Amino acid sequence: IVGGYTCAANSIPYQVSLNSGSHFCGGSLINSQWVVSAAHCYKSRIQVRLGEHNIDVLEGNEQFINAAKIITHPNFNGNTLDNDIMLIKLSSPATLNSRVATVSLPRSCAAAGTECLISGWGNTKSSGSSYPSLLQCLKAPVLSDSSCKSSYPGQITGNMICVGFLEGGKDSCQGDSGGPVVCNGQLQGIVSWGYGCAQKNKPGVYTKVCNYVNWIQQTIAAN
């Protein structure tokens, strides 16, 4: 997250870190036993870390739970990043408390202009690298489809939304992928991709969660 601020500890209780030796993607807890992330974050083994704030230091509220099943959208395309969504079934349910909690799926898609909260442990610089220990937070609005497509000609599908600032300076970045975009208490986006970070007229592009609510339901029903 470029241009954001340090979140209050454990104040984003649905945030998870996906770990394979070290942090590499975020995710969102949507059920005590299910996490949603980006399909490009797939690995065949993943440790899900809940209740995290400082990813480098154990502070006492973390839960470390291995993934039992990892399921990418069957029409995910690694070249266009269309359908960039993945479900993870935890090997046991998380214990829910004030520091580990679920977030709701959307009842409807978010309108342009809706204000959202983005979070993660990704790079905080637009040029160069600074990976933080502490969870970062960012308020940003959903942009209209036309501005989105105008920023990224021929690259935006019906399953993608742009969230951010056309003037640049504030955005998600490498290491934030799979993380949540929460608007009015509903998960509306998943950090997916962009051209650089926080660049002018290149806002972040996010998986449009509201198009996948049925897919998620049916996948869980089969597992």
């Binding site: 490009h40 490498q174 991709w193 970070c197």
Partner: peptide, 30 residues
């Protein structure tokens, strides 16, 4: 277009499509 996954790298081939291995040995946009 480069996905916002954190990958430590040595060569461009360690990165996903759209990214390059940059000066700090992380995948990113060129």
């Amino acid at each position: 277009g480069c996905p916002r996954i954190l990958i430590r790298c040595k060569q461009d081939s360690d990165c996903l499509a759209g990214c390059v291995c940059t000066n700090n040995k992380f995948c990113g946009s060129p």
